[PDB]
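Final report, Chapter 2: Outcomes

The project's central promise was a pipeline that accepts a single protein chain and returns its three-dimensional structure in a standardized token representation, suitable for archiving and comparison. That pipeline is now operational. To close this chapter, we reproduce one record exactly as it appears in the project archive, with the input sequence first and the structure output second.
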Amino acid sequence: MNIFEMLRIDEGLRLKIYKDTEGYYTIGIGHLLTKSPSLNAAKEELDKAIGRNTNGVITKDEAEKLFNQDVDAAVRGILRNAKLKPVYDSLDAVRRAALINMVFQMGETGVAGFTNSLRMLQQKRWDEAAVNLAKSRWYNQTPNRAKRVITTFRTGTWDAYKNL
């Protein structure tokens, strides 16, 4: 169980364009095409990314490729981040995956917002950061995924991902 297998469970895999909980055009393993409302504008982004004329359809392969580049960018995102880096450095390996999971999902900006729970993570206050994490819109939008992530920061194990 590692960051890739966790993210796969949470985002799933979709070969055709889709919209996320916020109304954004996404594809593959949670890959965000763009924030612009146009389906054409998104389909352009997809082609410029996959490099070929897809018609908003891709293969398992091209989705796996976006996934690798997305995990990688999430990681360098935490490391270039002055709010995020020190919390990351301060965490263990499992917990570290939890934070990449979040940045993958809502971006460095979205996650740096979480000041109070980030502060609590950097202080090892497992229990209090979880409550804080649950007190949020993220939780309400994506509650089962949020639960898994939260528990991961809680317990430090992959339990949420191994049990029903």
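Archive annotation: The first strand starts at residue 14 and ends at 19.
This record, like all others produced under the grant, will remain available to the consortium after the project formally closes.
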